[PDB]
Amino acid sequence: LDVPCKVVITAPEGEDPHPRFGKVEMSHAKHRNVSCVSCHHMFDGCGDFQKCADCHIDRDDRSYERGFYKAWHSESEISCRGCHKAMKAKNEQTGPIGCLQGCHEA
């Protein structure tokens, strides 16, 4: 499909991930009310799509804004956890925040 309904997000090739943190499912359908650029923040209205880890490569420095970990966990509202925390602070229905809740579960 042009936009797959569910995606499986993994670590890039290289260092195996911690066994409990290696794959996360995300649904584009559940995020239908979130604009593409809210997540695909480098999309400027046309062009094609990459994996986030085509840029968010570094796995060793979890503080680095352009690294792998911060793509998903930064306080930035671009990140999975950052948006969900910001929405929760607004009492808005949103996604999970706990480390083994939802994303890293099941």
| Cβ atoms of residues 47 and 40 within 8 Å | no
- Under the binding rule (CB under 6 A), the answer on residue 72 touching ligand HEC is yes
Nearer to a copy of itself among residue 4 and residue 98 (C-beta): 4
Q: Which does 22 bind (CB under 5 to 8 A by kind): a copy of itself, ligand HEC, none?
A: ligand HEC
Pairwise CA distance, residues 41 & 81, whole Å: 15
Looking at residues 83 to 102 of the shown chain, list those that interact with ligand HEC (rule: CB under 6 A): 83-84, 87, 93-97, 99, 102
**Please, after which residues is the chain broken with C–N above 2.5 Å?**
none
| Cβ atoms of residues 102 and 80 within 8 Å | no
Query: Does 5 appear as a known binding residue?
Result: no
What letter would DSSP give residue 18?
Answer: P
- Under the binding rule (CB under 8 A), the answer on residue 92 touching a copy of itself is no
Pairwise CA distance, residues 66 & 53, whole Å: 9
* Residues 4-43: x where in contact with ligand HEC by CB under 6 A, - otherwise, as a string: x--x-xxx-----xx--xxxx-xxx-xx--x-x-xxxxx-
| Cβ atoms of residues 40 and 31 within 8 Å | no
Residues annotated in a binding site: 28, 31, 36, 39-41, 51-52, 55-56, 59, 73-74, 80, 83-84, 99, 103-104
Residues contributing to the annotated binding site for heme c: 28, 31, 36, 39-41, 51-52, 55-56, 59, 73-74, 80, 83-84, 99, 103-104
